[PDB]
Amino acid sequence: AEFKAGSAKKGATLFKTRCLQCHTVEKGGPHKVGPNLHGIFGRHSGQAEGYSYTDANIKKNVLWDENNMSEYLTNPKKYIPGTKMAFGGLKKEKDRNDLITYLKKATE
Ligand code: HEC
């Protein structure tokens, strides 16, 4: 289960079609249904300012690096049981690689 760099342009389209409805990426962006994801890489789960998380997300206690992010997005409910993120996952590894490649650039 390992991250390789991919197309940033493809993961931008995957983000907008699958994530943007619940999330934002810019600094000082609004919390919508899910939390703003700025500075997500390097931070642990459940740690964005002013967002009310489920205990499941906090208690998971994992660093959001590229591999843990990729495992989470394969199937969120399996990785964090009781998470309120209503998302089934991205099954293809290529799509997760592309999304993370985009999301690392967008969220810093
Ligand atoms: C709602 C319809 C969502 C969609 C679609 C996606 N996400 Fe989400 N995400 C959502 C919520 C409500 C939460 C909070 C988790 C909880 O149960 O408390 C999340 C959480 C995440 C996280 C973890 C953030 C953290 O721990 O600080 C990540 C990394 C995340 N979401 C990413 C993400 C991606 C990449 C998506 C599409 C590809 C996506 N989410 C869709 C709500 C919703």
Short mmCIF file of N, CA, C and O and ligand atoms in Angstrom, two decimals:
data_model
loop_
_atom_site.label_atom_id
_atom_site.label_comp_id
_atom_site.label_asym_id
_atom_site.label_seq_id
_atom_site.Cartn_x
_atom_site.Cartn_y
_atom_site.Cartn_z
N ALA A 1 0.86 -1.23 0.00
CA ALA A 1 0.00 0.00 0.00
C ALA A 1 0.89 1.27 0.00
O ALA A 1 1.10 1.92 1.07
N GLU A 2 1.42 1.58 -1.19
CA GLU A 2 2.34 2.70 -1.32
C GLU A 2 2.06 3.79 -2.37
O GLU A 2 1.77 3.56 -3.54
N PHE A 3 2.22 5.03 -1.90
CA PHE A 3 2.00 6.23 -2.72
C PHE A 3 3.15 6.44 -3.71
O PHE A 3 4.33 6.40 -3.34
N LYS A 4 2.78 6.66 -4.97
CA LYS A 4 3.69 7.16 -6.01
C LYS A 4 3.06 8.43 -6.56
O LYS A 4 1.84 8.55 -6.59
N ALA A 5 3.90 9.37 -7.00
CA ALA A 5 3.40 10.62 -7.60
C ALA A 5 2.70 10.32 -8.92
O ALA A 5 3.07 9.39 -9.63
N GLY A 6 1.67 11.11 -9.23
CA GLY A 6 0.89 10.95 -10.46
C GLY A 6 0.49 12.29 -11.06
O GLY A 6 1.18 13.28 -10.87
N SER A 7 -0.62 12.30 -11.80
CA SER A 7 -1.11 13.50 -12.46
C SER A 7 -1.86 14.40 -11.48
O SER A 7 -2.89 14.00 -10.94
N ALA A 8 -1.35 15.61 -11.27
CA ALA A 8 -2.04 16.63 -10.47
C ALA A 8 -3.32 17.15 -11.13
O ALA A 8 -4.26 17.54 -10.43
N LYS A 9 -3.36 17.15 -12.46
CA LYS A 9 -4.54 17.62 -13.21
C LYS A 9 -5.72 16.67 -13.09
O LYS A 9 -6.86 17.11 -12.88
N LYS A 10 -5.45 15.36 -13.20
CA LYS A 10 -6.47 14.35 -12.94
C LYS A 10 -7.04 14.32 -11.51
O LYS A 10 -8.23 14.09 -11.36
N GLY A 11 -6.22 14.51 -10.48
CA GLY A 11 -6.72 14.53 -9.11
C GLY A 11 -7.45 15.81 -8.72
O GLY A 11 -8.23 15.81 -7.76
N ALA A 12 -7.20 16.89 -9.45
CA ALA A 12 -8.01 18.10 -9.35
C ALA A 12 -9.47 17.84 -9.79
O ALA A 12 -10.41 18.32 -9.16
N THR A 13 -9.63 17.06 -10.86
CA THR A 13 -10.96 16.73 -11.37
C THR A 13 -11.67 15.72 -10.47
O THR A 13 -12.89 15.79 -10.29
N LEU A 14 -10.90 14.77 -9.92
CA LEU A 14 -11.42 13.81 -8.94
C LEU A 14 -11.83 14.49 -7.64
O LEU A 14 -12.84 14.11 -7.04
N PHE A 15 -11.06 15.48 -7.20
CA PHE A 15 -11.42 16.25 -6.01
C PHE A 15 -12.72 17.02 -6.18
O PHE A 15 -13.59 16.98 -5.30
N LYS A 16 -12.86 17.71 -7.30
CA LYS A 16 -14.04 18.54 -7.57
C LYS A 16 -15.32 17.72 -7.77
O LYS A 16 -16.39 18.17 -7.39
N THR A 17 -15.18 16.54 -8.37
CA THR A 17 -16.32 15.64 -8.59
C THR A 17 -16.69 14.78 -7.38
O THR A 17 -17.84 14.34 -7.28
N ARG A 18 -15.73 14.52 -6.48
CA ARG A 18 -15.96 13.64 -5.32
C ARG A 18 -15.86 14.28 -3.93
O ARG A 18 -16.44 13.73 -2.99
N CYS A 19 -15.13 15.39 -3.78
CA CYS A 19 -14.82 15.95 -2.45
C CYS A 19 -15.30 17.38 -2.21
O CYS A 19 -15.77 17.69 -1.12
N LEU A 20 -15.16 18.25 -3.22
CA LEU A 20 -15.43 19.69 -3.10
C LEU A 20 -16.80 20.04 -2.51
O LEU A 20 -16.92 21.06 -1.83
N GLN A 21 -17.81 19.22 -2.78
CA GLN A 21 -19.14 19.40 -2.18
C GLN A 21 -19.12 19.45 -0.64
O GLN A 21 -19.87 20.22 -0.04
N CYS A 22 -18.26 18.64 -0.01
CA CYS A 22 -18.10 18.59 1.45
C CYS A 22 -16.85 19.33 1.98
O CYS A 22 -16.80 19.62 3.17
N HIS A 23 -15.86 19.60 1.12
CA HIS A 23 -14.55 20.13 1.55
C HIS A 23 -14.07 21.37 0.79
O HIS A 23 -14.46 21.60 -0.36
N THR A 24 -13.21 22.14 1.44
CA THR A 24 -12.42 23.19 0.80
C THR A 24 -10.93 22.96 1.09
O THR A 24 -10.60 22.27 2.05
N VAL A 25 -10.07 23.55 0.27
CA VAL A 25 -8.61 23.35 0.35
C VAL A 25 -7.77 24.60 0.68
O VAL A 25 -6.66 24.46 1.19
N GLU A 26 -8.28 25.80 0.37
CA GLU A 26 -7.52 27.04 0.58
C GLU A 26 -7.32 27.37 2.06
O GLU A 26 -8.08 26.91 2.92
N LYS A 27 -6.29 28.17 2.35
CA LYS A 27 -6.04 28.65 3.71
C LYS A 27 -7.16 29.59 4.14
O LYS A 27 -7.62 30.42 3.36
N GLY A 28 -7.61 29.43 5.39
CA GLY A 28 -8.77 30.15 5.90
C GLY A 28 -10.08 29.82 5.19
O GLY A 28 -11.00 30.64 5.19
N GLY A 29 -10.16 28.64 4.59
CA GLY A 29 -11.36 28.22 3.87
C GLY A 29 -12.45 27.81 4.84
O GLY A 29 -12.16 27.48 5.99
N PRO A 30 -13.72 27.84 4.39
CA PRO A 30 -14.83 27.51 5.29
C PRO A 30 -14.98 26.01 5.52
O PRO A 30 -14.82 25.22 4.59
N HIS A 31 -15.27 25.63 6.76
CA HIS A 31 -15.77 24.29 7.06
C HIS A 31 -17.15 24.18 6.44
O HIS A 31 -18.00 25.03 6.71
N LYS A 32 -17.37 23.18 5.60
CA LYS A 32 -18.70 22.90 5.07
C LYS A 32 -19.24 21.67 5.82
O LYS A 32 -19.23 21.68 7.05
N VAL A 33 -19.69 20.62 5.11
CA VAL A 33 -20.15 19.40 5.78
C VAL A 33 -18.95 18.73 6.44
O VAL A 33 -19.03 18.37 7.61
N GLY A 34 -17.87 18.59 5.68
CA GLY A 34 -16.57 18.14 6.20
C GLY A 34 -15.64 19.32 6.48
O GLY A 34 -15.93 20.45 6.07
N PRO A 35 -14.51 19.08 7.17
CA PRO A 35 -13.57 20.16 7.50
C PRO A 35 -12.74 20.65 6.32
O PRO A 35 -12.49 19.89 5.38
N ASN A 36 -12.35 21.92 6.37
CA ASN A 36 -11.32 22.49 5.49
C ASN A 36 -10.04 21.68 5.65
O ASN A 36 -9.62 21.38 6.77
N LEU A 37 -9.41 21.35 4.53
CA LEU A 37 -8.28 20.43 4.50
C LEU A 37 -6.92 21.10 4.33
O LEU A 37 -5.94 20.42 4.01
N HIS A 38 -6.82 22.41 4.57
CA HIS A 38 -5.54 23.12 4.43
C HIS A 38 -4.56 22.70 5.52
O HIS A 38 -4.91 22.71 6.70
N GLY A 39 -3.35 22.33 5.11
CA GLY A 39 -2.33 21.83 6.03
C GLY A 39 -2.63 20.46 6.61
O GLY A 39 -2.15 20.13 7.69
N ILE A 40 -3.41 19.65 5.88
CA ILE A 40 -3.80 18.30 6.34
C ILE A 40 -2.60 17.35 6.42
O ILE A 40 -2.50 16.56 7.37
N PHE A 41 -1.69 17.44 5.45
CA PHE A 41 -0.49 16.59 5.44
C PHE A 41 0.51 17.10 6.48
O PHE A 41 0.88 18.27 6.47
N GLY A 42 0.93 16.20 7.37
CA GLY A 42 1.75 16.57 8.54
C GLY A 42 0.95 16.65 9.83
O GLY A 42 1.52 16.48 10.91
N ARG A 43 -0.35 16.93 9.73
CA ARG A 43 -1.25 17.00 10.88
C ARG A 43 -1.89 15.64 11.14
O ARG A 43 -2.00 14.82 10.22
N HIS A 44 -2.28 15.39 12.38
CA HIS A 44 -3.01 14.16 12.75
C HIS A 44 -4.50 14.34 12.52
O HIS A 44 -4.97 15.44 12.21
N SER A 45 -5.24 13.24 12.66
CA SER A 45 -6.69 13.26 12.46
C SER A 45 -7.40 13.99 13.60
O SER A 45 -6.95 13.96 14.75
N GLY A 46 -8.49 14.68 13.26
CA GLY A 46 -9.32 15.37 14.23
C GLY A 46 -8.79 16.69 14.77
O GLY A 46 -9.21 17.11 15.85
N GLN A 47 -7.91 17.36 14.02
CA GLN A 47 -7.15 18.51 14.55
C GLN A 47 -7.32 19.87 13.83
O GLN A 47 -6.62 20.82 14.17
N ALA A 48 -8.25 19.98 12.89
CA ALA A 48 -8.54 21.28 12.26
C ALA A 48 -9.26 22.20 13.24
O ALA A 48 -10.14 21.75 13.99
N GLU A 49 -8.89 23.48 13.25
CA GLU A 49 -9.49 24.49 14.12
C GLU A 49 -10.99 24.64 13.88
O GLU A 49 -11.41 24.80 12.74
N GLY A 50 -11.77 24.58 14.95
CA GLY A 50 -13.19 24.92 14.91
C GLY A 50 -14.12 23.97 14.19
O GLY A 50 -15.23 24.37 13.82
N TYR A 51 -13.70 22.72 13.98
CA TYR A 51 -14.58 21.70 13.38
C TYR A 51 -14.91 20.62 14.41
O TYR A 51 -14.02 20.05 15.02
N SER A 52 -16.21 20.34 14.56
CA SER A 52 -16.69 19.34 15.51
C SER A 52 -16.61 17.94 14.88
O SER A 52 -17.45 17.57 14.05
N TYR A 53 -15.59 17.19 15.26
CA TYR A 53 -15.35 15.83 14.74
C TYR A 53 -16.10 14.77 15.54
O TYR A 53 -16.45 15.00 16.70
N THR A 54 -16.30 13.61 14.92
CA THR A 54 -16.71 12.41 15.66
C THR A 54 -15.54 11.93 16.52
O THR A 54 -14.38 12.17 16.18
N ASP A 55 -15.86 11.25 17.62
CA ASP A 55 -14.84 10.66 18.49
C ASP A 55 -13.99 9.63 17.74
O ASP A 55 -12.78 9.54 17.97
N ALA A 56 -14.62 8.87 16.84
CA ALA A 56 -13.94 7.90 15.97
C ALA A 56 -12.74 8.48 15.21
O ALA A 56 -11.67 7.88 15.18
N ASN A 57 -12.93 9.66 14.61
CA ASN A 57 -11.88 10.34 13.85
C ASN A 57 -10.72 10.79 14.75
O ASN A 57 -9.55 10.67 14.36
N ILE A 58 -11.04 11.31 15.94
CA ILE A 58 -10.02 11.74 16.90
C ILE A 58 -9.29 10.53 17.48
O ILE A 58 -8.05 10.50 17.51
N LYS A 59 -10.06 9.54 17.93
CA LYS A 59 -9.51 8.33 18.56
C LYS A 59 -8.64 7.47 17.65
O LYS A 59 -7.79 6.74 18.14
N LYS A 60 -8.85 7.56 16.33
CA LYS A 60 -8.03 6.84 15.36
C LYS A 60 -6.54 7.17 15.50
O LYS A 60 -5.70 6.26 15.42
N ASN A 61 -6.22 8.45 15.70
CA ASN A 61 -4.86 8.90 16.03
C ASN A 61 -3.82 8.40 15.00
O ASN A 61 -2.98 7.54 15.31
N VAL A 62 -3.92 8.94 13.79
CA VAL A 62 -2.97 8.63 12.73
C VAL A 62 -2.49 9.92 12.08
O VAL A 62 -3.25 10.89 11.97
N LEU A 63 -1.23 9.92 11.65
CA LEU A 63 -0.68 11.00 10.84
C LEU A 63 -1.25 10.91 9.45
O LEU A 63 -1.25 9.83 8.84
N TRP A 64 -1.75 12.03 8.93
CA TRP A 64 -2.13 12.09 7.52
C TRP A 64 -0.87 12.32 6.69
O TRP A 64 -0.48 13.46 6.43
N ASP A 65 -0.21 11.21 6.35
CA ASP A 65 0.84 11.20 5.33
C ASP A 65 0.21 10.59 4.07
O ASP A 65 -1.01 10.37 4.04
N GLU A 66 1.01 10.28 3.06
CA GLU A 66 0.47 9.86 1.76
C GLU A 66 -0.13 8.46 1.79
O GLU A 66 -1.17 8.22 1.17
N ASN A 67 0.50 7.53 2.52
CA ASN A 67 0.03 6.14 2.60
C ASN A 67 -1.24 5.98 3.44
O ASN A 67 -2.15 5.23 3.06
N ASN A 68 -1.32 6.68 4.57
CA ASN A 68 -2.50 6.60 5.45
C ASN A 68 -3.71 7.28 4.82
O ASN A 68 -4.83 6.77 4.93
N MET A 69 -3.48 8.42 4.18
CA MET A 69 -4.48 9.09 3.35
C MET A 69 -5.03 8.16 2.27
O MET A 69 -6.23 8.08 2.07
N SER A 70 -4.13 7.46 1.58
CA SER A 70 -4.52 6.55 0.50
C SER A 70 -5.34 5.36 1.01
O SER A 70 -6.31 4.95 0.36
N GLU A 71 -4.97 4.80 2.16
CA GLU A 71 -5.73 3.72 2.79
C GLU A 71 -7.10 4.21 3.27
O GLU A 71 -8.09 3.48 3.16
N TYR A 72 -7.15 5.42 3.82
CA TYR A 72 -8.41 6.04 4.25
C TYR A 72 -9.38 6.18 3.07
O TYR A 72 -10.53 5.79 3.17
N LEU A 73 -8.89 6.73 1.96
CA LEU A 73 -9.73 6.97 0.78
C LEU A 73 -10.12 5.71 0.00
O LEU A 73 -11.02 5.79 -0.83
N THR A 74 -9.45 4.58 0.24
CA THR A 74 -9.89 3.29 -0.32
C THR A 74 -11.27 2.90 0.22
O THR A 74 -12.11 2.38 -0.52
N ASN A 75 -11.49 3.15 1.52
CA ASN A 75 -12.73 2.83 2.22
C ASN A 75 -12.69 3.51 3.60
O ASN A 75 -12.13 2.94 4.54
N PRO A 76 -13.23 4.74 3.72
CA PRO A 76 -13.18 5.51 4.98
C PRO A 76 -13.81 4.83 6.20
O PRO A 76 -13.24 4.88 7.29
N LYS A 77 -14.98 4.21 6.00
CA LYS A 77 -15.71 3.58 7.10
C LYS A 77 -14.99 2.36 7.68
O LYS A 77 -15.15 2.05 8.86
N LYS A 78 -14.21 1.67 6.85
CA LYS A 78 -13.39 0.54 7.31
C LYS A 78 -12.17 1.03 8.09
O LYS A 78 -11.81 0.43 9.11
N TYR A 79 -11.53 2.09 7.60
CA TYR A 79 -10.35 2.66 8.25
C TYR A 79 -10.70 3.36 9.56
O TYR A 79 -9.96 3.25 10.54
N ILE A 80 -11.82 4.08 9.57
CA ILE A 80 -12.32 4.76 10.77
C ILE A 80 -13.80 4.37 10.95
O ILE A 80 -14.68 5.03 10.41
N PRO A 81 -14.06 3.26 11.69
CA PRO A 81 -15.44 2.88 11.99
C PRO A 81 -16.19 3.96 12.77
O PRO A 81 -15.67 4.48 13.75
N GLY A 82 -17.40 4.29 12.31
CA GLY A 82 -18.22 5.33 12.93
C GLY A 82 -17.94 6.75 12.45
O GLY A 82 -18.48 7.70 13.03
N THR A 83 -17.09 6.91 11.43
CA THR A 83 -16.87 8.22 10.81
C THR A 83 -18.13 8.65 10.07
O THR A 83 -18.81 7.82 9.44
N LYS A 84 -18.47 9.93 10.18
CA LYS A 84 -19.66 10.48 9.52
C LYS A 84 -19.42 10.93 8.07
O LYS A 84 -20.36 11.38 7.42
N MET A 85 -18.18 10.82 7.59
CA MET A 85 -17.85 11.07 6.18
C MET A 85 -18.58 10.06 5.29
O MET A 85 -18.16 8.91 5.16
N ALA A 86 -19.69 10.50 4.69
CA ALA A 86 -20.47 9.66 3.77
C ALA A 86 -19.77 9.61 2.41
O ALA A 86 -20.12 10.35 1.48
N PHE A 87 -18.76 8.75 2.32
CA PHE A 87 -18.02 8.51 1.09
C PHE A 87 -17.61 7.04 1.05
O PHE A 87 -17.03 6.53 2.00
N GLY A 88 -17.93 6.37 -0.06
CA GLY A 88 -17.64 4.95 -0.22
C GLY A 88 -16.18 4.63 -0.47
O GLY A 88 -15.69 3.59 -0.03
N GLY A 89 -15.50 5.51 -1.21
CA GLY A 89 -14.05 5.39 -1.47
C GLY A 89 -13.69 5.49 -2.93
O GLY A 89 -14.56 5.48 -3.80
N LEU A 90 -12.39 5.60 -3.20
CA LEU A 90 -11.82 5.44 -4.54
C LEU A 90 -11.05 4.12 -4.55
O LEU A 90 -10.02 4.00 -3.88
N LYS A 91 -11.55 3.14 -5.30
CA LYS A 91 -10.96 1.80 -5.30
C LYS A 91 -9.65 1.69 -6.09
O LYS A 91 -8.75 0.97 -5.66
N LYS A 92 -9.55 2.40 -7.21
CA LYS A 92 -8.33 2.37 -8.02
C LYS A 92 -7.19 3.12 -7.34
O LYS A 92 -7.38 4.26 -6.91
N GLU A 93 -6.03 2.48 -7.24
CA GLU A 93 -4.83 3.08 -6.63
C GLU A 93 -4.32 4.28 -7.43
O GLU A 93 -3.86 5.26 -6.83
N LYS A 94 -4.40 4.19 -8.75
CA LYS A 94 -3.99 5.29 -9.64
C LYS A 94 -4.75 6.59 -9.34
O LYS A 94 -4.15 7.66 -9.30
N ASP A 95 -6.06 6.48 -9.12
CA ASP A 95 -6.90 7.65 -8.82
C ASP A 95 -6.58 8.27 -7.46
O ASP A 95 -6.58 9.50 -7.33
N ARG A 96 -6.29 7.43 -6.47
CA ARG A 96 -5.86 7.90 -5.15
C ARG A 96 -4.48 8.57 -5.19
O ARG A 96 -4.27 9.59 -4.52
N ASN A 97 -3.55 7.99 -5.95
CA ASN A 97 -2.23 8.61 -6.18
C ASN A 97 -2.36 10.00 -6.82
O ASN A 97 -1.72 10.95 -6.38
N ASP A 98 -3.18 10.09 -7.86
CA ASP A 98 -3.43 11.36 -8.57
C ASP A 98 -4.08 12.41 -7.66
O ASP A 98 -3.67 13.58 -7.67
N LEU A 99 -5.07 11.99 -6.87
CA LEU A 99 -5.75 12.89 -5.94
C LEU A 99 -4.82 13.43 -4.86
O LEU A 99 -4.87 14.63 -4.55
N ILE A 100 -3.99 12.56 -4.28
CA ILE A 100 -3.06 12.96 -3.24
C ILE A 100 -1.99 13.90 -3.81
O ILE A 100 -1.63 14.89 -3.17
N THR A 101 -1.51 13.61 -5.02
CA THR A 101 -0.58 14.49 -5.75
C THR A 101 -1.16 15.89 -5.94
O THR A 101 -0.45 16.88 -5.79
N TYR A 102 -2.45 15.97 -6.28
CA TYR A 102 -3.15 17.26 -6.34
C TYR A 102 -3.30 17.88 -4.95
O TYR A 102 -2.97 19.05 -4.75
N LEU A 103 -3.80 17.07 -4.02
CA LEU A 103 -4.20 17.56 -2.70
C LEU A 103 -3.00 18.04 -1.86
O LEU A 103 -3.16 18.96 -1.07
N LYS A 104 -1.83 17.43 -2.04
CA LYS A 104 -0.60 17.91 -1.39
C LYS A 104 -0.21 19.32 -1.84
O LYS A 104 0.28 20.11 -1.04
N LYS A 105 -0.41 19.62 -3.13
CA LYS A 105 -0.11 20.94 -3.68
C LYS A 105 -1.17 21.96 -3.29
O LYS A 105 -0.83 23.10 -2.95
N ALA A 106 -2.44 21.56 -3.34
CA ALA A 106 -3.56 22.45 -3.02
C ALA A 106 -3.63 22.83 -1.53
O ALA A 106 -3.93 23.98 -1.20
N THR A 107 -3.34 21.87 -0.65
CA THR A 107 -3.52 22.06 0.80
C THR A 107 -2.35 22.73 1.53
O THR A 107 -2.55 23.17 2.67
N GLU A 108 -1.16 22.81 0.93
CA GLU A 108 -0.03 23.45 1.65
C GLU A 108 -0.19 24.97 1.65
O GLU A 108 0.32 25.66 2.54
C1 HEC B 1 -19.62 14.56 2.52
C2 HEC B 1 -20.65 14.37 1.69
C3 HEC B 1 -18.16 14.28 2.29
C4 HEC B 1 -17.52 13.89 1.11
C5 HEC B 1 -18.18 13.67 -0.24
C6 HEC B 1 -16.14 13.73 1.39
N1 HEC B 1 -15.93 14.04 2.71
FE1 HEC B 1 -14.12 13.95 3.75
N2 HEC B 1 -15.02 14.21 5.41
C7 HEC B 1 -16.32 14.52 5.57
C8 HEC B 1 -16.66 14.63 7.01
C9 HEC B 1 -18.04 14.96 7.55
C10 HEC B 1 -15.52 14.39 7.71
C11 HEC B 1 -15.34 14.37 9.22
C12 HEC B 1 -14.96 12.97 9.76
C13 HEC B 1 -15.68 12.57 11.05
O1 HEC B 1 -16.33 11.51 11.09
O2 HEC B 1 -15.63 13.25 12.09
C14 HEC B 1 -14.50 14.12 6.66
C15 HEC B 1 -13.19 13.84 7.02
C16 HEC B 1 -12.20 13.77 6.07
C17 HEC B 1 -10.81 13.66 6.36
C18 HEC B 1 -10.17 13.56 7.73
C19 HEC B 1 -9.87 14.98 8.22
C20 HEC B 1 -9.26 15.04 9.60
O3 HEC B 1 -9.17 14.02 10.31
O4 HEC B 1 -8.85 16.13 10.05
C21 HEC B 1 -10.15 13.67 5.17
C22 HEC B 1 -8.64 13.56 5.01
C23 HEC B 1 -11.12 13.80 4.14
N3 HEC B 1 -12.37 13.88 4.71
C24 HEC B 1 -10.84 13.81 2.77
C25 HEC B 1 -11.81 13.66 1.76
C26 HEC B 1 -11.51 13.42 0.37
C27 HEC B 1 -10.12 13.35 -0.23
C28 HEC B 1 -12.71 13.30 -0.30
C29 HEC B 1 -12.99 12.97 -1.73
C30 HEC B 1 -12.14 12.32 -2.53
C31 HEC B 1 -13.76 13.43 0.74
N4 HEC B 1 -13.14 13.65 1.92
C32 HEC B 1 -15.14 13.39 0.48
C33 HEC B 1 -17.30 14.68 4.61
C34 HEC B 1 -17.13 14.36 3.29
#
